[PDB]
Amino acid sequence: KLGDICFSLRYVPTAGKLTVVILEAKNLKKMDVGGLSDPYVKIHLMQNGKRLKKKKTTIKKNTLNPYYNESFSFEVPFEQIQKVQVVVTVLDYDKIGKNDAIGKVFVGYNSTGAELRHWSDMLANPRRPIAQWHTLQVEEEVDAMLAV
Template sequence: LTVGILQAADLMSMDSDPYVKIQLLQGGKRLKKKKTTVKKNTLNPYYNESFSFEIPLEQMQKILVAVTVFDYDKIGKNDAIGKIFVGSKATGLGLKHWSDMLANPRRPIAQWHYCILLISVL
C-alpha cells in the first residue's frame, strides 16, 4: 500500500508549520505510522511525499488509514488541524477513495478530502 501526501490547502491559521501523520489501523490498534516533513510558515503546504506499507492482500479489507494534519510546535504539544479516514471501515469519501483504489490495482487514485489535503492511494 502506498499513500501519497500531495498537498494541503486553506488550513486553519495556527502557527502555520503543518505536517501530516499517516497511521495504519486494524481493529482499533495502530500497526504502523509515518509522517511528512514539517512545512514552515504556510497554510497551503506542498508535500509530494509517498509512504509505502507492506500489507498482505488478505489484510487490505481490514486496514483503516488515518491521515491527520498537525501544526508543529517546538515547545508543547502539536495541535491537530484535521483528520480523515480512508479504508473499508471509513464512510463517505474515505470509503469511496478506498473502493476506487481496490478496483484499480497499481494505479494511483488521487482525491481531495474536505479541503484539508490531497492524497493518493495505490
C-alpha cells in the same frame, strides 16, 4: 472549516504493497498566535483500534497551503487489505508543547462518503494510483470512529 488534504492511494495485491502519497493541503486553519501554521502530516495504519505503523512528512514553515509530494508504503497482504484503515492527520508543529491536530480523515474499513469512494476505487484498480481531495474533520469525531 479546517482545510483539505490531497493524497493518492495505490495497492498492489501480489506484493501486498499499499502506497500513500501526500500531495498538498489547502485552506488550513490557523493554529499559531499572530501567524499561520507550520504544518506536517502523519499517516497511521490501523486495525481494530490499534496503531500498527506510523509515518510522517517533513514540516513546512509559515503556510496554510503546503505542498509535500512525499510517498510512504506499507506492507498489507491481500487477505488483510479490506480490514485496515489509513488515517491521515494534519498537525501544526511547535518546537515546545504537544503539536495540535488541525484535522484528520481516514480511508479503508468502516470509512464513509468520499473516503470510502477513494478506497473502493483503489481496490477496484490494482496498481493504479488514485489521487483525491478530502475535507479534514475534527479529531474528536474521527477518533471516536476509529476507537476500540
